[PDB]
Design a protein around this ligand. Structure first.
Ligand SMILES: Nc1ncnc2c1ncn2[C@@H]1O[C@H](COP(=O)(O)OP(=O)(O)O)[C@@H](O)[C@H]1O
Ligand SMILES: Nc1ncnc2c1ncn2[C@@H]1O[C@H](COP(=O)(O)OP(=O)(O)O)[C@@H](O)[C@H]1O
Ligand SMILES: Nc1ncnc2c1ncn2[C@@H]1O[C@H](COP(=O)(O)OP(=O)(O)O)[C@@H](O)[C@H]1O
Ligand SMILES: [Mg+2]
Ligand SMILES: [Mg+2]
Ligand SMILES: [Mg+2]
Lengths: 187, 106, 61, 522, 529, 521
């Protein structure tokens, strides 16, 4: 909240294990400015130079923007040759099912929200032959084509409470599968 | 260093290049560069009248440098305190002896 | 849904003024009818508070 | 394994809990019993975070004490209440509440229902408030000497009593300087407009209240002037650099004259903002947010001193001291928003930091105490005593009544309502006179603190107090001797005394109403 | 009566893992003993007869060396006084290049004799003032011991014979070959006007045959390989680029916008046409070879192949800067074919196979260049590493020789002469500090003695013979390491001398370290994390 | 109370450490001692992954051991360096170093001094190298058939003691032909070899053109003819596949027939690239980047060959074989950039389909199609062919060659023994020990051959005393015989490098007296 920033100068400490300049990225690293001492300045400029250099390096990586227009004929090229280490989140869907429409819109919002991972969306019927209608909403993530998580189900997925919890469920991988449910439990 | 240079070299700090004039240049009587190990230093000296000087400390190891830095800080503060008020007290514990004798008398 | 796209640079700065002026306008309308107490459910940023203090009305957010 | 309640539920009921409740209260009255009076002893507390708090006042003592018994929590709550409402009498109210609970314990044990004890306590509270208001001595607000005496009386029991004749004055000035009126409303807003700032290292008597505002900032640029005679202060809420905005933009460039054009437009916008802020010919500009390099260049070109990010409270104090007005859009800055009235702006150096002063204002409605001492704890204690003095002065200003201190008011109201009791017939007389004798604790505590035989001294105090026109006869805790407060010149504001009695009786009632405890559940 | 509590004071308020030492016995003698042990650790690796050591550092990487600074660096030292001693040694290495083992031995001997003096009854301050006075005296008398200055620093035989003694301490068996090789490398780079630089002498280590096949070239050698199709060029007109060999791209994100079919069809053709135009413009100036600092494009590689251009890629800024210095070119951040003044010239650029390591060679032919390179040959990586360390120490001794040269006798001559003169001086002082003066004598005696004990010969006999000859008046005699018996030899005829500056700095740092470790009276160590 | 070094560092000051180092060196050399000599034996080593390596060359065996002793590390490094420099003799150099240490250990057990020992080793080794350079026989004729026979004999003796010894004459000849048809650079990447499972050993073939495994096939392959009698090879570096134009571009149009024109233009770009390829007169198309299914179908309709995703090395060998040049632009496919080969064929050998370009006249690169029973079998054949390749390549520069079988070692030992009679002091004893250690090679060889080492070695010593040099062992007859007349020829450079490296490592090992082992942070 910004209201704590104006109530009083006495905001000494409450649940702050670490408080230094090394974790202030850009937005807040430039709002103290005059409070950064003087003897440790050169370290601050070294840190900012290194971290802006890293951000500039990631500029070449984080340019995907929004959703794209892949169909069945383009599946193999963009799931086996889409790149080295680039996450691809395959989506199998059909027009008419509401829950998959919800998850499609949420994925579209995620596309601009997170441009590092460029998920691709494809029609269910004309991507894999004889795909049953009992698997209308389908999402599976992988990198280099090695399919990791392929959760299937119309109602077991829970598209009503998807938003952030299953957003990071798709996002976070290459480790423990159950990692973000406790953040936003349905209860 | 902006303030130190504009008080030593005599120029003026500039935040923009809207107007440049010869009065915006300070003067330096010798600017050279000395490379120590891998680091480099630039010396700006032979000024006409510096209002800001530097103390260069040379040491065979780090702890000597820190000791000299602490000594220099204490000495500079002592001299500044002497300058601030035109007074100075006798040392070597004489003032404590005299003050205690006066306290006993009082 | 609506997002701005600027092709020639000159048209940019103008919209930025609009990006505030709209709010300004509404305030005067609320202040045009002699109102001196303002109660609102939503939050009020600093500029609108400045309008209210300059006019002489209090704002409660 | 069938359980009606949870496994963690624990029930306690009957006389025992009542006894326990009383015990808990008395325990807290046992901690701060030696911190009351002019001969109070310092108490040192070790902060859980690693700090040290060396105080005498009850609230600053009980704030660092963690207690698991709920009655002890209620005692800490009454301490905080007394601190927040009137600012003085914390140890007094804690001691009275504890000892009234103790004296009610006797009637609790003698198979007497607590409701009659509560009713008797309420009647005693009403009578004691009435007879405390009866013996009030009016004060003259304009008399500076009388207010100095009142503040000295309130402060002589604490650490800064040695410098009392100095610190007293400071408090008075502040309370006479934050005093304000607008739209028919008076504020005396000490919390927000009378800042007290502590700088370690120096001399206690070097501290002073300023005719202005001091803050810990420095000029953004070396060449900006550090010494202004009659500044024209202008305050800014917004920032003076280029910002992205809110709506997503994604400008598209195809021609070869659009990138440099965009950058030149940014610079032109900053230049326009600086020219528009210069148009009113100010002299020092203060902003809560950042200043871009080009913006301060343009400000320098017009000989303007700019101060970078400043907290909102400091800017409000500066606006109140200079009479200026904080603005967000420099396009909408008028002449009446330019602060004329500051008589000096000094960028001075203290220790190894730069402090800016806007001192010597025409009639500032916000001050700042440059409070210089030896250590952070010493200055924290002096800060607490200064707050105590300000609260007492504000209470006197808002209420022109006084009442004798040193234990004279306690014994006076005790004797008065005891004489009232000796007429009424009924079973409620015993708790009533129990409260009457309960107020005797303050003179007893003072005598015990100064180191005198409390038995015959207190008996003689009561005997001398039985004589008429002797309600100002109290005990001098400096030497522990029966004196007259009129000649000793100690009087406390009626607000503090009546608030103390009210909240003490109320919390005694609260802790006396409860007879069951259920512990452990979510 | 079964537990002794802590003293009511600093002992009770001290933290758990902290340790406090105070007093002459509990704080000073411990430091003296630890420094003595540290000095005796490396004393066995002194002089030409010093024995190599294998150290396995904390990352399990073998180091086979007799370099005192390297030995102290690889093993981590925990005692703090030993830490100060190794800092002094490392500073002596940085300021001079040779003299680390001398620093260790002298400091250890000084501390041992200081402990003896403190046991005798002198105070710490008395010993400190005596040591400083005798150090001033030794520095005053040192310039009078020089003999046979160099005065040329450009004759190949002279510089070889002058560096042979500095090399001899490590590579005793193969001494003349390394001396001649390093002398060639240093002379061929020695500028006529200016200051000698040690960063401009490079060494390249490649597995292969014995030491006798190591060579020197007047250029520089990389371990890369040409990315093109041409590998041999004569009279190379080198163009050096600091930008990737590709069409330059906006650093702001720019996407190709196509609105009609013909734009889509012609975009790739236009890009290829521009690329070939740029490459042809580069090659029309005469650029036989091109070196780039980054990625090479496929289209760029094809067009360089079309116009007979050798494309070499370098992956380090220092490598590119050294290449620019050695060829006379300068890196530029745009394609912009080079103008006549900023385009390097080289005699040839080989691609070669030597030790199953393909290399690209920018060698010159007329013995010039600001950079010369040593190619080292050996059957073990660690042995070539030791050879590289010996080469570096020899080159550092050459650089010190470019400064005040004033060669001084070595092999125990200088230290024994200094000890005799300091004894003579201390016999005159009637104060209480004379003992401390008379201690540098023994402090110098540790240097030749080690030289004796490392050669399998009696040390006391050699010391007595050295005193006999030095009191006779011959101040140029010292230990003979090939005699197999205690013997003396004139050190001027042997031509094995030391730099005056090296001894000056070594004595100064050793005395400073001993004094600053004697000054400590209390130690307060926090528990390590 | 306070320690100098960190807790964990242990030292080994004294001569017992160097004696233990000598012992460790012998323990290492025991693990290679039995892989030497024509009657050699292989060795099977299994790592923690369960992958077994079967080999009898010292370099690979020492690589596969989890060596951590520093002296053992020195022996591993000397074997690696000898392998990299010459190509063989790694077992010989390891055994020589270990025997030097063994023969010097009794002298150092009584202290002595490492410096005199290393001085004696240096003097002895430089004398030995000078003797080898002096006594090596040079043909000094610069003939054609004679030099080829010399290289064939060197290859034959290199192949002996390997898994494929029984086919020596079949491989040696073959392999030298490879080295006989390289440019004057002997770029090793131009002798790229291929191994196909199945088939007997004698079926290994040397493709004078370029042979490589087929990479991939899209829907449309197997309609192309697989036999061309005079094709024009087109070596490409371009991706002949419908794809995104730039992977950075973006199309923004607002009308339907613009969309149709754009898709037609993309198809037109693809067909224009393919049409330039076809009109260039080419007949077989090779590409580094993938070739799409559309390109394959188009090429099949034009009755011509295509094969994409070809590796770097295969395309380079094709370019230096068929005479073409790699192109990443199909806009200038002139008649001078295409490659020409006599015959191209897509055949099927050993259950694997391979492309053969055979008949290139000016082919500077070859290919080995190696046949075997098991993967480790063909891998050991690969290692043996690599050793032969290295030996022949080193022998191309100079026809200076000595006779193997321990004859050169015996002559060197006799020379050093004669030298150690005219010098006084302990140097003569150390040189005698060096010479006596130099005779391990014939003794170990005949021990591997299961002979009586003592009697045959006494015969060898007595013959090298007087009568004639080059007399070494003869396993088949269990006797001694003239190795030079037996056409067993090892280039002098391998012996020179082995002796130099062995002396270097022995001097390095003897010249240490202290070891510190920090606690492995
Ligand atoms: N000089 C004095 N002699 C005797 N009593 C005093 C004197 N000064 C103050 N008091 C009494 O002490 C009480 C204030 O003590 P203090 O330490 O402030 O307690 P509290 O913090 O509860 O107000 C007042 O009730 C006042 O009557
Ligand atoms: N032939 C020799 N006879 C006697 N002493 C020698 C001979 N050669 C070198 N020395 C001595 O050996 C010493 C080598 O010391 P060195 O190991 O270089 O010290 P540091 O390791 O501190 O550089 C020199 O001081 C030199 O005087
Ligand atoms: N047919 C043979 N007759 C006699 N000696 C041979 C024969 N083949 C090999 N040798 C000897 O065996 C020794 C070991 O050679 P080899 O095992 O092939 O490789 P390495 O020398 O690397 O061990 C060589 O010194 C060689 O002289
Ligand atoms: Mg009070
Ligand atoms: Mg040395
Ligand atoms: Mg072999």
């Amino acid at each position: 909240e910004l209201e704590e920033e104006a109530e009083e100068e006495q905001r000494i400490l409450q649940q702050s294990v670490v408080k230094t300049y090394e974790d202030m990225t850009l937005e807040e690293l430039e709002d103290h400015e005059d409070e950064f001492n003087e003897e440790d300045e050169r370290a601050i400029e070294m840190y900012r130079r290194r971290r802006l250099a890293e951000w500039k390096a990631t500029k070449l990586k984080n340019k995907f923007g929004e959703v794209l227009e892949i169909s069945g004929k383009d599946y193999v090229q963009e799931v086996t040759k889409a790149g080295e280490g680039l996450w691809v989140i395959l989506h199998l869907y059909k027009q008419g099912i509401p829950l998959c429409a919800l998850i499609n819109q949420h994925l579209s919002g995620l596309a601009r929200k997170f441009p590092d991972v460029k998920f691709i969306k494809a029609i269910s019927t004309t991507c894999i032959p004889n795909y049953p209608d009992r698997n209308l909403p389908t999402i599976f993530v992988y990198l280099e084509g090695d399919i990791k998580a392929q959760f299937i189900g119309p109602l077991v997925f829970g598209g009503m409470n998807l938003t952030r919890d299953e957003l990071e469920w798709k996002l976070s991988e290459s480790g423990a599968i159950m990692t973000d449910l406790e953040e936003n439990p349905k209860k | 260093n902006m303030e130190r240079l504009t008080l030593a070299c005599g120029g003026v700090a500039l935040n923009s290049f809207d107007d440049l004039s010869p009065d915006c240049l300070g003067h330096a009587g010798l600017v050279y560069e000395y490379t120590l190990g891998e680091e480099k230093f630039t010396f700006i000296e032979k000024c006409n009248n510096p209002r800001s000087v530097t103390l260069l400390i040379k040491g065979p190891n780090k702890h000597t440098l820190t000791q000299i830095k602490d000594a220099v800080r204490d000495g500079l503060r002592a001299v500044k305190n002497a300058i601030d008020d035109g007074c100075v007290v006798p040392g070597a514990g004489a003032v404590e002896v005299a003050m205690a004798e006066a306290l006993i008398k009082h | 849904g609506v997002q701005v796209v600027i092709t020639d640079p000159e048209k940019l700065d103008q919209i930025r003024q609009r990006e505030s002026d709209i709010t300004k306008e509404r305030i005067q309308k609320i202040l045009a009818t002699g109102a001196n107490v303002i109660l609102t459910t939503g939050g009020i940023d600093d500029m609108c508070l400045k309008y209210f203090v300059e006019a002489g009305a209090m704002a409660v957010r | 394994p069938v359980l009606v309640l949870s496994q963690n539920t624990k029930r306690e009921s009957g006389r025992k809990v009542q006894s326990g409740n009383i015990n808990a209260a008395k325990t807290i009255a046992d901690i701060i019993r030696t911190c009351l009076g002019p001969k109070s002893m310092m108490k040192m507390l070790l902060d859980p975070m690693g700090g040290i708090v060396m105080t005498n006042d009850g609230n600053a003592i009980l704030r660092e004490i963690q207690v698991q018994h709920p009655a002890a929590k209620s005692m800490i709550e009454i301490s905080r209440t007394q601190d927040e409402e009137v600012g003085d009498g914390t140890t007094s109210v804690i001691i009275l509440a504890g000892e009234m609970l103790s004296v009610a314990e006797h009637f609790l044990e003698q198979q007497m229902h607590p409701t009659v004890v509560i009713s008797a306590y309420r009647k005693a509270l009403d009578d004691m408030i009435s007879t405390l208001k009866k013996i009030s001595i009016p004060v003259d607000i304009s008399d500076s000497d009388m207010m100095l005496n009142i503040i000295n009386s309130s402060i002589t029991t604490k650490a800064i009593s040695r410098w009392s004749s100095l610190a007293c004055n400071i408090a008075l000035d502040a309370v006479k300087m934050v005093q304000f009126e607008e739209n028919g409303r008076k504020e005396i807003d000490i919390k927000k407009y009378a800042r007290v700032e502590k700088i370690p290292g120096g001399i206690i008597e070097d501290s002073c209240v300023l005719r202005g505002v001091m803050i810990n900032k420095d000029v953004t640029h070396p060449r900006m002037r550090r010494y202004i005679k009659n500044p024209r202060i202008v305050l800014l809420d917004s920032s003076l650099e280029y910002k992205k905005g809110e709506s997503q933009t994604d400008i598209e460039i195809t021609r070869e004259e659009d990138f440099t054009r965009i950058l030149q437009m940014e610079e032109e916008y900053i230049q326009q903002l600086c020219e528009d802020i210069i148009q009113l010919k100010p002299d020092v500009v203060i902003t809560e947010k950042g200043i871009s390099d080009l913006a301060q260049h343009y400000l320098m070109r017009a000989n303007i001193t700019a101060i970078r990010r400043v907290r909102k409270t400091d800017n409000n104090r500066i606006a109140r001291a200079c009479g200026a007005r904080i603005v967000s859009r420099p396009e909408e800055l008028r002449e009446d928003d330019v602060g004329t009235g500051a008589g000096l702006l000094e960028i001075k150096k203290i220790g190894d930091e730069y402090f800016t002063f806007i001192t010597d204002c025409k009639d500032p409605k916000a001050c700042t105490i440059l409070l210089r001492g030896a250590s952070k704890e010493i200055l924290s204690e002096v800060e607490r005593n200064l707050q105590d003095a300000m609260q007492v002065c504000r209470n006197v200003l808002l209420d022109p009544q006084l009442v004798p201190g040193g234990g004279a008011s306690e014994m006076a109201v005790a004797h008065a309502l005891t004489e009232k009791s000796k007429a009424m017939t009924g079973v409620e007389q015993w708790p009533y006179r129990a409260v009457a004798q309960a107020l005797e604790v303050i003179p007893r505590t003072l005598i015990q603190n100064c180191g005198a035989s409390t038995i015959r001294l207190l008996t003689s105090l009561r005997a001398k107090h039985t004589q008429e026109n002797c309600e100002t006869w109290g005990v001098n805790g400096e030497t522990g001797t029966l004196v007259d407060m009129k000649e000793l010149g100690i009087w406390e504001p009626l607000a503090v005394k009546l608030q103390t009695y009210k909240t003490a009786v109320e919390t005694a009632v609260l802790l006396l109403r409860i007879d069951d405890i259920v512990s452990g559940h979510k | 009566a079964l537990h002794v509590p802590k003293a009511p004071g600093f002992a009770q308020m001290l933290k758990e893992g902290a340790k406090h030492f105070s007093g002459l016995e509990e704080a000073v003698y411990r430091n003296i003993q630890a420094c003595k042990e540290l000095a005796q650790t490396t004393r066995t690796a002194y002089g030409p007869n010093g024995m190599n050591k294998m150290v396995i550092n904390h990352l399990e990487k073998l180091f086979v060396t007799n370099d005192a600074a390297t030995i102290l660096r690889e093993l981590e030292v925990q005692h703090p006084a030993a830490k100060m001693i190794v800092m002094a040694s490392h500073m002596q290495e940085q300021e001079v290049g040779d003299g680390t083992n001398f620093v260790l031995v002298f400091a250890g001997a000084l501390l041992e004799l200081a402990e003896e003096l403190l046991r005798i009854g002198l105070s710490v301050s008395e010993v400190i003032e005596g040591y400083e006075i005798a150090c001033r005296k030794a520095h005053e008398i040192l310039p009078n011991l020089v003999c046979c200055s160099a005065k040329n620093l450009r004759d190949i035989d002279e510089v070889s014979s002058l560096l042979r003694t500095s090399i001899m301490s490590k590579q005793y068996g193969n001494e003349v070959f390394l001396a001649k090789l390093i002398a060639q490398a240093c002379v061929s780079i020695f500028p006529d006007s200016g200051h000698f630089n040690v960063d401009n002498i490079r060494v390249c280590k490649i597995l292969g045959s014995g030491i006798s096949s190591s060579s020197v070239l007047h250029g520089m050698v990389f371990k890369k390989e040409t990315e093109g199709d041409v590998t041999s060029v004569k009279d190379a007109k080198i163009a050096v680029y600091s930008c990737p060999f590709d069409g330059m791209i906006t650093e702001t994100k720019g996407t190709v916008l196509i609105k009609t079919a013909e734009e889509l069809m012609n975009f790739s053709k236009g890009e290829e046409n521009l690329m070939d135009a740029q490459v042809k413009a580069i090659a029309d100036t005469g650029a036989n070879v091109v070196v780039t600092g980054g990625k090479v494009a496929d289209m760029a590689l094809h067009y360089a192949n079309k116009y007979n251009i050798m494309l070499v890629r370098l992956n380090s800024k220092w490598d590119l800067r050294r290449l620019c210095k050695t060829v006379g070119a300068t890196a530029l951040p745009r394609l912009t074919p080079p103008v006549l003044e900023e385009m390097g010239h080289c005699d040839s650029v080989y691609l070669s196979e030597v030790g199953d390591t393909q290399v690209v060679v920018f060698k010159h032919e007329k013995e010039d260049g600001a950079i010369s390179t040593i190619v080292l040959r050996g059957s073990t990586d660690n042995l070539m590493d030791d050879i590289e360390r010996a080469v570096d120490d020899g080159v550092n001794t050459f650089k010190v020789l470019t400064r005040d040269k004033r060669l001084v006798p070595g092999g125990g001559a200088t230290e024994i002469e200094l000890a005799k003169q300091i004894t003579s001086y201390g016999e005159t002082c009637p104060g209480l500090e004379q003992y401390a003066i008379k201690k540098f004598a023994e402090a110098f005696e540790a240097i030749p003695r080690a030289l004796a004990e490392n050669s399998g010969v009696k040390a006391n006999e050699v010391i007595s013979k050295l005193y006999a000859v030095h009191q006779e008046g011959n101040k140029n005699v010292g230990l003979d390491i090939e005699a197999e018996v205690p013997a003396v030899k004139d050190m001027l005829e042997a031509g094995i001398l030391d730099t005056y500056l090296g001894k000056y700095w070594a004595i100064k740092l050793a005395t400073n370290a001993a004094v600053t470790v004697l000054r400590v009276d209390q130690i307060i160590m926090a528990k390590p994390a | 109370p306070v320690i100098l070094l960190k807790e964990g560092t242990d030292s080994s000051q004294g001569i017992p450490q160097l004696v233990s180092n000598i012992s460790a060196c012998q323990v290492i050399a025991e693990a290679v001692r039995t892989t030497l000599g024509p009657r050699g034996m292989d060795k099977l080593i299994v790592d923690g992954r369960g992958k077994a390596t079967i080999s009898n060359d010292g370099a690979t065996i020492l690589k596969l051991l989890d060596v951590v002793h520093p002296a053992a590390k020195t022996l591993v490094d000397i074997a690696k360096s000898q392998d990299a420099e010459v190509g063989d003799g790694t077992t010989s150099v390891t055994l020589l170093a270990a025997e030097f240490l063994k023969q010097v250990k009794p002298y150092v057990e009584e202290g002595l001094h490492p410096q005199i020992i290393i001085r004696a080793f240096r003097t002895a080794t430089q004398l030995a190298v000078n003797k080898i350079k002096e006594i090596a026989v040079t043909v000094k004729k610069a003939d054609k058939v004679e030099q080829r026979k010399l290289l064939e004999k060197c290859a034959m003796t290199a192949l002996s003691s390997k898994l494929i010894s029984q086919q020596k004459a079949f491989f040696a000849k073959m392999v030298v032909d490879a080295v006989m048809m390289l440019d004057d650079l002997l770029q090793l990447k131009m002798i790229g070899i291929k191994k196909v499972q199945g088939g007997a050993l004698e079926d290994s073939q040397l493709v004078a053109g370029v042979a490589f495994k087929k990479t991939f096939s899209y829907a449309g392959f197997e309609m192309q003819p697989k036999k061309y009698h005079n094709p024009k090879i087109a070596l490409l570096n371009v991706e002949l596949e419908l794809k995104a134009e730039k992977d950075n571009a973006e199309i923004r149009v607002h009308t339907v027939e613009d969309y149709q024109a754009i898709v037609d233009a993309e198809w037109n770009i693809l067909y224009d690239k393919l049409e330039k390829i076809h009109h260039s007169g080419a007949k077989v198309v090779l590409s580094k980047l993938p070739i799409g299914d559309v390109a394959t179908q188009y090429f099949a309709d034009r009755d011509m060959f295509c094969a994409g995703r070809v590796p770097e090395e295969d395309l380079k060998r094709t370019m230096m074989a068929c005479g073409g040049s790699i192109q990443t632009s199909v806009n200038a496919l002139s008649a001078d950039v295409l490659g020409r080969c006599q015959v191209f064929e897509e055949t099927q050998i050993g259950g694997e389909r391979y492309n053969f370009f055979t008949g290139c006249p000016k082919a500077k690169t070859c290919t080995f199609i190696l046949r075997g029973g098991a993967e480790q079998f063909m891998e050991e054949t690969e290692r043996s062919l690599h050793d032969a390749i290295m030996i022949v390549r080193r022998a191309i520069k100079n026809d200076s060659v000595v006779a193997g079988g321990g004859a050169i070692e015996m002559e060197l030992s006799k020379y050093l023994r004669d030298y150690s009679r005219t010098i006084p002091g302990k140097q003569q004893l150390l040189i005698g020990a060096y010479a006596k250690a130099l005779e391990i090679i014939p003794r170990q060889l005949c021990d591997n051959a299961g002979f009586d080492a003592t009697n045959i070695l006494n015969k060898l010593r007595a013959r090298h005393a007087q009568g004639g040099t080059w007399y070494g062992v003869d396993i088949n007859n269990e006797d001694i015989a003239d190795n030079f007349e037996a056409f067993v020829w090892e280039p002098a450079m391998v012996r020179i490098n082995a002796l130099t490296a062995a002396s270097e490592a022995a001097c390095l090992i003897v010249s240490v007296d202290e070891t510190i082992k920090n606690p492995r942070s």
